[PDB]
Symmetry: C2
Subunit: 141 residues, 2 copies
């Protein structure tokens, strides 16, 4: 599409997934394509579980968004994950989550995601994503 | 009251706490539109986030953190299906603990995970 070759084209242009996701409650999308994606979470006050601890839902949520963008397949959703939250995150800390597809088939894909703070790994997880033929999704179950 | 955990957690953005005590807890997620990833599926962050809240409340320890999880999302969760997440300690040495959490919609299982929690 032309509106993707304009040097000013919005980043989200070719994204086929997370169509209703408010990035302000998740992470800012930085890049995607070629089986990878990067998103950046700078935690906000509303994301805290404790004074000095960002709630796991926002850490895993940011990683989930990167994983989905790395595959970028219409009609996909996260089906399973195994994740390690290596360190507690505080407000203001910028965390980059880098997703890379590690296995793929027409049906199912595994996406590995690492979250880094100042180039130090603070998060790692593998996400399984399934791709369906029908929407809404519930028709497939 | 009695709760040592999640002192900064905004329940309006997460789930309502229903009960806790005796190494167990229940929270109930009523998904809201801001939680959607797609028209027809709630974002995994809010589903895992509700489960994580339940798990931390089951253990109910100061200075705790979720350090790992293994989760299956068993069905898409949709806007305003009420999901109950029931958490139970399955293992603890005080320092490290495992909590099993199951999420149900009308008594049918839509979520299962184990959460590892560290306490300092």
């Amino acid at each position: 599409a032309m509106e993707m070759n304009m040097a000013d084209a919005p980043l989200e242009e070719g994204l086929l997934v997370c169509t209703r996701l408010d990035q302000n409650l998740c992470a800012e999308l930085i890049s995607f394509g070629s089986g990878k994606a990067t998103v950046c979470l700078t935690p906000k006050e509303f994301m805290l579980a404790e004074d000095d601890v960002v709630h796991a839902g926002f850490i895993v949520g940011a990683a989930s968004f990167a994983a989905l963008c790395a595959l970028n397949k219409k009609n996909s959703l996260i089906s399973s994950m195994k994740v390690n939250l290596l360190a507690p995150i505080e407000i203001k800390q910028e965390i980059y989550f880098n997703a890379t597809i590690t296995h793929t088939s027409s049906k199912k894909s595994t996406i590995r995601v690492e979250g880094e703070f100042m180039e130090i790994k603070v998060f790692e997880g593998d996400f399984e994503i399934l791709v369906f033929e029908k929407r809404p999704f519930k028709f497939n179950f």
